[PDB]
Each structure stands twice: as C-alpha cells, then as structure tokens.
Amino acid sequence: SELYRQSLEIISRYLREQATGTSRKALETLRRVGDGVQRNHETAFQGMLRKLDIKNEDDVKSLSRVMIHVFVTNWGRIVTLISFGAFVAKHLKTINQESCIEPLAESITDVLVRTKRDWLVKQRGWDGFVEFFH
Template identity: 40%
Template sequence: IHVCAMDVTGMINTLYVDDRGDNVKFLSAVAHSIFEDGTVNWGRVASLTSFGAAVCRYLRGKGRDNCVDLVGEEISEYLVTHHKDWLVKHNSWTGFVEFFPVAEPESRCRNIIMTIFGLAGIGATMTFLVM
C-alpha cells in the first residue's frame, strides 16, 4: 500500500496539482487517457474514481478541502458526458456495487481457514513425498 501511495503521489506531482489553484480540469485529461482506446468497464471507472480519491486525500493534506467537491464534480461530469450510455446500460451505481461485491466477514474467515488448511495439506504432502 505504501508503494502504491508513493506512485500516486508521484503521478499527482507530475500533474503540478499544487500550481493549479482550484482548477481540477486536469482530471478530465487523466480520464480521457484512461478511456482513450474506447474501452469502458468497471475496472477503469474504479481506477478513475480511486485516482480522484487519492487527489482528494492529497489536496486535503495540503489544506485545500474546498477542492474536494470539485474533484468529484469533475469526475462525475466526465463520466456522464462521455460514458452516460454505458453507465445506464450497466445499471449505474447499482451495477458498480454488484460488480464489486463486498465479502461478508463470515466468508472471509472461511476463506482464511480454508487457505490455512490448504497450505498445511500441501506442506504435509511435500513432507511425505520427500521421505
């Protein structure tokens, strides 16, 4: 996570966010580069919104809370202007939530336990084969 945060900060620095004042129009250029090949999918929408969240965190850290709403508005405007039909076809926010389901705590615990037992089984099998 730390490396990813450094990468995002590096990207933000290359966009000279500190020199732009309240102008967040650069986000439309970032969005355009994400979608420039014409492919729209939830992964790209998530990438854009995640980058927007990182920009918001960066701006908030610089005491520029007033820009946070502007970031959301700019990203929303881009998506609605350029990809409205795709978003509607894929159930908008509901489609996004359905595509990225949140695992229930019980299933996470079950997956962790199954992974531990699976690894233990692999270890036992390898030990048996070595003997």
C-alpha cells in the same frame, strides 16, 4: 440526470469520508474496493500526481481536461478513476486546499457521466457497479 444526481452524491460522499477518515450499496462497495486500489496504486498515483502541479482550482479544472481525454470500459477502471480522486482529495487536504475537494468530485463525476453514459444506461447504473464487486 437521475444517474448524475446519485453519481455526484456517491463520488462526493466517498471523496469526503476518504479525505476526513443503490446509493447505500455503491458507497459500501466503494469503501471496500477504493482503499485496496489506492494501496496497490500508491506509487502509481504518487508518480502521476508528482508530474501534475495541483496548487489551485485552475489545475483541478485542467486535471479534468486530461482525465476526459485519457478516457475498454469496466467498473474496475471506473473505481480506479474515483480511487485516484480520493488520493488527490487526501493530498488537497494535506496542502490546505480542502475547498478544491467538492469541485474535484464534480470534475470526476462530469468526466464519468460524459464519456461513458451509454455504458451506464446499458449497465443499469450503480446497481451494475455493486454486481461487478459483489
């Protein structure tokens, strides 16, 4: 969909620049909130990641199964999911699995647009995300 194209664009772009170091407003919004959410969820994300063996793309595809199962809907919970993505992306970089980063972004985008599409249409998509954190 039109939303999916921007979604994967935004989520992939954000997970990339995080791994290294409307769509324009969503990205800036994501830059603002994401690092704050990772910092406070540091011990949370660590604990969750520690109980999830991710040494390959098999585990990345298996991570989306529990991500799409574990999924109240608000931009807070959405930015937390994408933020957890950035945290796993950084991890994948430290263990020489950089090639699993674009697929991780796709898995997260898949889960977001699948389970909560009704809500995003209702929200005016990423224009709404920018408003929630405005």
